[PDB]
């Protein structure tokens, strides 16, 4: 994965971290823009950042927690909403 600052994550519209990336940071709750809905397919995850992610905008459907970089997030079945939070198990 490309280098990413500890408190940040970068979403890509291709698998394997290809193409231009969109950077988000700890403290952001994001409903993905209409034009980018379901279009993110990999994510570089910074050392102190954690992504809480949902298939649907209303925080339902396939659910994921990503604490490490993901080369393929196809399995969430179309990413629509996520939060970037401090990377802590508690
Ligand atoms: Ca979706
Ligand atoms: K992390």
PDB file of C-alpha atoms and ligand atoms in Angstrom:
ATOM      1  CA  UNK A   1       0.000   0.000   0.000  1.00  0.00           C
ATOM      2  CA  UNK A   2       1.035   3.636  -0.602  1.00  0.00           C
ATOM      3  CA  UNK A   3       2.330   5.508   2.433  1.00  0.00           C
ATOM      4  CA  UNK A   4      -0.409   7.065   4.508  1.00  0.00           C
ATOM      5  CA  UNK A   5      -0.172   9.273   7.598  1.00  0.00           C
ATOM      6  CA  UNK A   6      -1.101   7.544  10.911  1.00  0.00           C
ATOM      7  CA  UNK A   7      -4.425   9.328  11.452  1.00  0.00           C
ATOM      8  CA  UNK A   8      -5.483   9.089   7.841  1.00  0.00           C
ATOM      9  CA  UNK A   9      -6.971   6.655   5.343  1.00  0.00           C
ATOM     10  CA  UNK A  10      -6.995   6.849   1.549  1.00  0.00           C
ATOM     11  CA  UNK A  11      -9.826   5.334  -0.516  1.00  0.00           C
ATOM     12  CA  UNK A  12      -9.216   4.300  -4.122  1.00  0.00           C
ATOM     13  CA  UNK A  13     -11.692   3.663  -6.927  1.00  0.00           C
ATOM     14  CA  UNK A  14      -9.687   0.675  -8.130  1.00  0.00           C
ATOM     15  CA  UNK A  15      -8.433  -2.440  -6.394  1.00  0.00           C
ATOM     16  CA  UNK A  16      -4.839  -2.656  -5.175  1.00  0.00           C
ATOM     17  CA  UNK A  17      -4.578   1.036  -4.329  1.00  0.00           C
ATOM     18  CA  UNK A  18      -4.492   2.178  -7.963  1.00  0.00           C
ATOM     19  CA  UNK A  19      -5.466   5.569  -9.361  1.00  0.00           C
ATOM     20  CA  UNK A  20      -6.123   8.820  -7.538  1.00  0.00           C
ATOM     21  CA  UNK A  21      -6.888   8.463  -3.840  1.00  0.00           C
ATOM     22  CA  UNK A  22      -9.321  10.337  -1.624  1.00  0.00           C
ATOM     23  CA  UNK A  23      -7.900  11.110   1.810  1.00  0.00           C
ATOM     24  CA  UNK A  24     -10.019  11.062   4.974  1.00  0.00           C
ATOM     25  CA  UNK A  25      -8.935  11.361   8.623  1.00  0.00           C
ATOM     26  CA  UNK A  26      -9.838  10.217  12.136  1.00  0.00           C
ATOM     27  CA  UNK A  27     -12.897  12.146  13.336  1.00  0.00           C
ATOM     28  CA  UNK A  28     -14.800  12.032  10.039  1.00  0.00           C
ATOM     29  CA  UNK A  29     -18.142  10.319   9.497  1.00  0.00           C
ATOM     30  CA  UNK A  30     -18.776  10.060   5.776  1.00  0.00           C
ATOM     31  CA  UNK A  31     -21.770   9.324   3.621  1.00  0.00           C
ATOM     32  CA  UNK A  32     -20.067   8.794   0.294  1.00  0.00           C
ATOM     33  CA  UNK A  33     -21.007  11.386  -2.391  1.00  0.00           C
ATOM     34  CA  UNK A  34     -23.597  10.170  -4.904  1.00  0.00           C
ATOM     35  CA  UNK A  35     -21.016  10.234  -7.687  1.00  0.00           C
ATOM     36  CA  UNK A  36     -18.667   8.030  -5.662  1.00  0.00           C
ATOM     37  CA  UNK A  37     -21.321   5.718  -4.213  1.00  0.00           C
ATOM     38  CA  UNK A  38     -20.165   2.048  -4.266  1.00  0.00           C
ATOM     39  CA  UNK A  39     -17.107   3.142  -6.291  1.00  0.00           C
ATOM     40  CA  UNK A  40     -14.365   2.654  -3.676  1.00  0.00           C
ATOM     41  CA  UNK A  41     -12.544  -0.677  -3.976  1.00  0.00           C
ATOM     42  CA  UNK A  42      -9.439  -0.425  -1.809  1.00  0.00           C
ATOM     43  CA  UNK A  43      -8.235   1.612   1.147  1.00  0.00           C
ATOM     44  CA  UNK A  44      -4.852   2.421   2.664  1.00  0.00           C
ATOM     45  CA  UNK A  45      -5.191   2.643   6.428  1.00  0.00           C
ATOM     46  CA  UNK A  46      -2.870   4.717   8.598  1.00  0.00           C
ATOM     47  CA  UNK A  47      -1.236   3.321  11.735  1.00  0.00           C
ATOM     48  CA  UNK A  48      -3.592   4.932  14.300  1.00  0.00           C
ATOM     49  CA  UNK A  49      -6.728   4.956  12.139  1.00  0.00           C
ATOM     50  CA  UNK A  50      -9.596   2.482  11.937  1.00  0.00           C
ATOM     51  CA  UNK A  51     -12.457   2.397   9.420  1.00  0.00           C
ATOM     52  CA  UNK A  52     -15.982   1.399  10.435  1.00  0.00           C
ATOM     53  CA  UNK A  53     -17.844   0.719   7.201  1.00  0.00           C
ATOM     54  CA  UNK A  54     -21.319  -0.124   5.883  1.00  0.00           C
ATOM     55  CA  UNK A  55     -22.922  -1.232   2.647  1.00  0.00           C
ATOM     56  CA  UNK A  56     -25.913   1.100   3.148  1.00  0.00           C
ATOM     57  CA  UNK A  57     -26.118   4.821   3.958  1.00  0.00           C
ATOM     58  CA  UNK A  58     -28.252   4.149   7.047  1.00  0.00           C
ATOM     59  CA  UNK A  59     -25.527   2.012   8.664  1.00  0.00           C
ATOM     60  CA  UNK A  60     -27.041  -1.351   7.706  1.00  0.00           C
ATOM     61  CA  UNK A  61     -26.087  -4.142   5.314  1.00  0.00           C
ATOM     62  CA  UNK A  62     -22.600  -5.656   5.136  1.00  0.00           C
ATOM     63  CA  UNK A  63     -20.478  -4.274   7.984  1.00  0.00           C
ATOM     64  CA  UNK A  64     -16.673  -4.066   8.164  1.00  0.00           C
ATOM     65  CA  UNK A  65     -13.991  -2.841  10.536  1.00  0.00           C
ATOM     66  CA  UNK A  66     -10.682  -2.210   8.773  1.00  0.00           C
ATOM     67  CA  UNK A  67      -7.617  -1.564  10.924  1.00  0.00           C
ATOM     68  CA  UNK A  68      -5.188  -2.395   8.101  1.00  0.00           C
ATOM     69  CA  UNK A  69      -4.940  -1.596   4.392  1.00  0.00           C
ATOM     70  CA  UNK A  70      -7.373  -3.498   2.167  1.00  0.00           C
ATOM     71  CA  UNK A  71      -6.493  -4.259  -1.477  1.00  0.00           C
ATOM     72  CA  UNK A  72     -10.082  -5.341  -2.298  1.00  0.00           C
ATOM     73  CA  UNK A  73     -13.266  -4.328  -0.475  1.00  0.00           C
ATOM     74  CA  UNK A  74     -15.648  -5.821  -3.057  1.00  0.00           C
ATOM     75  CA  UNK A  75     -17.107  -8.040  -0.382  1.00  0.00           C
ATOM     76  CA  UNK A  76     -18.945  -5.187   1.408  1.00  0.00           C
ATOM     77  CA  UNK A  77     -21.140  -5.166  -1.704  1.00  0.00           C
ATOM     78  CA  UNK A  78     -20.869  -1.460  -2.477  1.00  0.00           C
ATOM     79  CA  UNK A  79     -19.441   0.934   0.113  1.00  0.00           C
ATOM     80  CA  UNK A  80     -21.803   3.803   0.965  1.00  0.00           C
ATOM     81  CA  UNK A  81     -20.914   4.988   4.461  1.00  0.00           C
ATOM     82  CA  UNK A  82     -17.949   4.865   6.823  1.00  0.00           C
ATOM     83  CA  UNK A  83     -16.424   6.488   9.898  1.00  0.00           C
ATOM     84  CA  UNK A  84     -12.716   6.975  10.502  1.00  0.00           C
ATOM     85  CA  UNK A  85     -12.037   6.502  14.210  1.00  0.00           C
ATOM     86  CA  UNK A  86      -9.091   6.106  16.590  1.00  0.00           C
ATOM     87  CA  UNK A  87      -7.626   2.608  16.158  1.00  0.00           C
ATOM     88  CA  UNK A  88      -8.504   1.088  19.525  1.00  0.00           C
ATOM     89  CA  UNK A  89     -10.169  -2.250  20.312  1.00  0.00           C
ATOM     90  CA  UNK A  90     -12.133  -0.654  23.148  1.00  0.00           C
TER      91      UNK A  90
HETATM   92 CA1  LIG B   1     -23.979   0.725  -1.069  1.00  0.00          CA
HETATM   93  K1  LIG B   2      -4.669   1.191  11.895  1.00  0.00           K
END
